[PDB]
Every structure is written in C-alpha cells, then in structure tokens.
Design a protein around this ligand. Sequence first.
Ligand SMILES: *[C@@H]1O[C@H](CO)[C@@H](O[C@@H]2O[C@H](CO)[C@@H](O[C@@H]3O[C@H](CO[C@H]4O[C@H](CO)[C@@H](O)[C@H](O)[C@@H]4O)[C@@H](O)[C@H](O[C@H]4O[C@H](CO)[C@@H](O)[C@H](O)[C@@H]4O)[C@@H]3O)[C@H](O)[C@H]2NC(C)=O)[C@H](O)[C@H]1NC(C)=O
Ligand SMILES: *[C@@H]1O[C@H](CO)[C@@H](O[C@@H]2O[C@H](CO)[C@@H](O[C@@H]3O[C@H](CO[C@H]4O[C@H](CO)[C@@H](O)[C@H](O)[C@@H]4O)[C@@H](O)[C@H](O[C@H]4O[C@H](CO)[C@@H](O)[C@H](O)[C@@H]4O)[C@@H]3O)[C@H](O)[C@H]2NC(C)=O)[C@H](O)[C@H]1NC(C)=O
Lengths: 203, 197
Amino acid sequence: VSAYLSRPSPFDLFIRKSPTITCLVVDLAPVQLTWSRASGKPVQHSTRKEEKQRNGTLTVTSTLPVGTRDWIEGETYQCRVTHPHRALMRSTTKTSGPRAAPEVYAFATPEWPGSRDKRTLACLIQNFMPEDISVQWLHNEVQLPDARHSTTQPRKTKGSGFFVFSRLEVTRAEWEQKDEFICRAVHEAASPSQTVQRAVSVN
Amino acid sequence: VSAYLSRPSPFDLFIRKSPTITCLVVDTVQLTWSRASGKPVQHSTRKEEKQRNGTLTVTSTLPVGTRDWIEGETYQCRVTHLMRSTTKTSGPRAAPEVYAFATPEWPGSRDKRTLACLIQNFMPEDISVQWLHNEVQLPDARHSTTQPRKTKGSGFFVFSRLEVTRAEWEQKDEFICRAVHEAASPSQTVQRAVSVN
Ligand SMILES: *[C@@H]1O[C@H](CO)[C@@H](O[C@@H]2O[C@H](CO)[C@@H](O[C@@H]3O[C@H](CO[C@H]4O[C@H](CO)[C@@H](O)[C@H](O)[C@@H]4O)[C@@H](O)[C@H](O[C@H]4O[C@H](CO)[C@@H](O)[C@H](O)[C@@H]4O)[C@@H]3O)[C@H](O)[C@H]2NC(C)=O)[C@H](O)[C@H]1NC(C)=O
Ligand SMILES: *[C@@H]1O[C@H](CO)[C@@H](O[C@@H]2O[C@H](CO)[C@@H](O[C@@H]3O[C@H](CO[C@H]4O[C@H](CO)[C@@H](O)[C@H](O)[C@@H]4O)[C@@H](O)[C@H](O[C@H]4O[C@H](CO)[C@@H](O)[C@H](O)[C@@H]4O)[C@@H]3O)[C@H](O)[C@H]2NC(C)=O)[C@H](O)[C@H]1NC(C)=O
C-alpha cells in the first residue's frame, strides 16, 4: 500500500489553464482519499477512480482541480489516505530553486533500408530547471495526440539542467502533405509564453 | 525491501567475454546464488553502502560462464533477512538501427556541443551503448543513456547523450556511437559516426 502525489503538467498549467493533481494509491490488498490545502482554504470536488489491475492489485486514484494562481503562488496540497480507523500523508507544491529555460533541438533521421514509408523525428530538450516539462509535437500548426509520441524521463546533465528526448514516428503522407513538424516544450522558465519550439524537415 | 536481478550487459557478454549478473537489494542481509542446472556457482562480490536517505543498499555481483549463459542457464538470487531468477531472453531478434547527430551551437555556450544518438528497432531490450573518439573508447561516465522503451510497433529504442568541449571536436570531428546487441552482425556491434562541423 503505497501512495504517490503528482504535480500539474506544465501543459495543463500554462496552456490549457486547468491544472490538476493526482493522488495514486497502489493497494496491494483489495480506502478514503481526503484532500486539503496547507493554507486551510477550501478544495474543489475531486474525482475518485478505482480499478483492479492485471496482476490483481487494486489501484485508486483521486484527481483534484487546483487554481492556476494558487499553484503558481506556492500553495501546498495534501493527500491523506485512510481506512475505517493510522494514515498516509502525501503533499505536493511547486519546485523551488534556480530556473533555466529549455533548449530545443529537433532532428529527422534519414531513411533506414526497407522502410521507405516511415521516418522518425526526434527532439532533444536540455538544460532546463526545474525538471517539470511538457513536450508536444505539432504538424500543420495543429497539436498531435499525446499518444503519438513518447518522452523519456528527465535526467540530470553533468553540470546543471535536465534533459529529455522525445520521439515521433511519421508516415510518408504526413511529411508529403507538409514537410514541417514542430517540437514544443512547455516549461515554467521559458519566456515570455512558457514555450520554446523548434521546427524540423524530413527532406 | 525491493529486490532486482539484472542480466549481463551485452558489452560484458560479447566483447569483454566476462559477463556478470547483479542482485540488488534496497532498504545483515544474506544473498545466495544458485543455478537451475544444479552446477556450482562462482564466488560473488557483496557491496554494501548507506545512502543519503538513511537506507542501506546491498548488491551482489556474480560472474557467470559465457557459454553457460548463452546456452540457456537459469540463475537464482535468494534473499534472507524471497527469490529472483534470470535467464537469457527468448523470442524474435532484430538488429539495432543507429543514428548519431550533433546539436548546433546554442547561443551562449560556444565552448560546448551536444552529441546525441538514437538507437531503435532492436529486439530484445538488452543493449550496451558506448562512445568512441578517434577510435578510442570514452569512459562510461562521459555519457548517459535512457532506459529501453517499447516502440509503437516492433522493437525498442534508447537515446544516448554525450557532451563534448571545443578542443575535442577541433582536434578530430570523429565521434562514434556504438551499440552492442546480440542480434547485430557481425561481432554483435553496430556503430555510426558523427561530425560536429
Ligand atoms: C500491479 O500492477 C500495477 C500496474 O502496473 C502496479 O502499479 C504500479 O506501481 C508502481 C510502483 O508501485 C507505480 O510506479 C510509480 O509511479 C509514480 C507515478 O508515475 C505515473 O505518473 C507520472 C506523472 O506524475 C508519470 O510521469 C509516470 O509515467 C506514471 O504515469 C511515480 O511517481 C513513481 O516514481 C517513484 O518511484 C520509483 C520507484 O518505483 C523511483 O525510481 C522514482 O525515482 C520515483 O521516486 C513510480 O514509478 C506505477 O505507476 C503503478 N502503475 C499503475 C498505477 O498503472 C503494481 O505495483 C503491481 N503490483 C505488484 C505487486 O507487482
Ligand atoms: C534512497 O536512495 C537510493 C539511491 O537513489 C534508492 O535506491 C534506489 O531504489 C530504487 C527502488 O525502486 C531502485 O530502482 C530500481 O533499480 C533497478 C536496477 O536497475 C539497474 O539497471 C538499470 C539498467 O536498466 C540501471 O539504469 C539502473 O540504474 C540500475 O543500475 C531497476 O531495474 C528497477 O526498474 C524497475 O522499474 C522500471 C520502470 O520503473 C522497470 O523497467 C524495471 O523492469 C523494474 O520493474 C528500479 O528502477 C534504484 O536502482 C536504487 N538506486 C540505487 C543507487 O540503489 C532508494 O530507493 C531510496 N530510498 C527510498 C525510501 O526512496
């Protein structure tokens, strides 16, 4: 029975402007989740989700909407996990410390033998702080569904700053409609709109 | 009290030809090896260190025979204060496709460049990534590699990152990204060079 409490994605916080936090309870034995704010102020209604897993574990998640300004101005949120009558407290707040905007480099790999129809696009995003980042790919100025790319977890560079890589597979028809895809990073330290974007062309 | 058992790195298995397997225990603890075939195991090395978060990490590294491992032996690590087992991966094989590239100079950092490597479409997941400069292997701490992730279709991919300084590429603009993998032919290595400028 462990619990995990996430921060809002940069995308939800700065672009969609409706941030949420999630409390995730992996219950090894088939539970109330209670939200509160350190400031003492009221919390919104939360959404409780539960599901038996493919290994027989019960998973419970509660998703709480939070105010944008509240979150950016340093509010702490608390998830309390209890049974009918000991408890587990998780809390989350924005990260402190120095800020640094991400640097974005997008690349297209050449044709590998035997797959004339598919190209791989890659994006290196590095030297940002703190490590919360959202990565999106755009094609023809429209944002692609999140499930079409995968992004690695942030790792520490040698000095300061984190880096992630993102991967996008494109078909021949996509780059032949227009040969410009965009890798966009959403991060709190990027100015002035909290986004940094770079284009790449297949041929 | 978590326990993990790791297969040999392809580098140790196919290049060095001295593969090891590692039993990692996080949070005295007895760590005992056995072979499924019943044969004896070699002498292992127990490492113990306290971490910053007050937990104690115990690892045991066990040398294994190369032919034994490649022909399908199953090894077991049992923990005593709970067992884990490991064996060569089975299934379809596919060689890694390697692409190495250099980032353009980022405004401000004129003395540094980032080399990166994409390696994808390989099966199974075990892979070793190394960087060479002027045909000499760089120390492993110079680079970092992501964990193998499943592709949308068939295969896995990893990314590797190597920061280099101005003096390095000016004296030779030949860096090589080399993958060691069981399905790569020949000699289980595939590699691709990149130049900065
Ligand atoms: C039965 O099967 C279920 C389903 O697979 C297992 O549930 C998984 O349990 C593990 C840990 O017990 C969970 O891993 C943890 O996930 C946390 C949340 O990650 C999600 O959300 C973030 C956004 O905040 C995404 O980036 C991420 O990709 C996930 O979507 C992480 O925060 C945790 O990381 C911390 O712990 C790890 C060690 O595990 C450290 O290495 C990290 O540094 C970090 O401190 C952690 O990774 C996993 O999410 C669960 N899967 C679910 C809910 O689908 C059961 O464990 C399994 N039961 C048994 C007995 O095997
Ligand atoms: C106090 O601080 C210490 C030091 O950071 C923590 O120790 C870590 O504990 C976690 C426990 O979850 C360990 O995480 C596990 O490590 C396994 C070892 O992997 C080795 O091989 C890989 C190659 O792939 C290396 O990259 C890696 O660094 C190791 O050398 C992983 O195999 C485990 O992976 C599991 O989850 C992933 C996805 O999340 C799956 O793909 C795997 O199949 C597997 O299910 C896992 O990541 C971590 O290695 C420990 N580090 C050290 C240095 O000891 C303590 O946990 C921490 N204490 C507390 C209470 O937080």
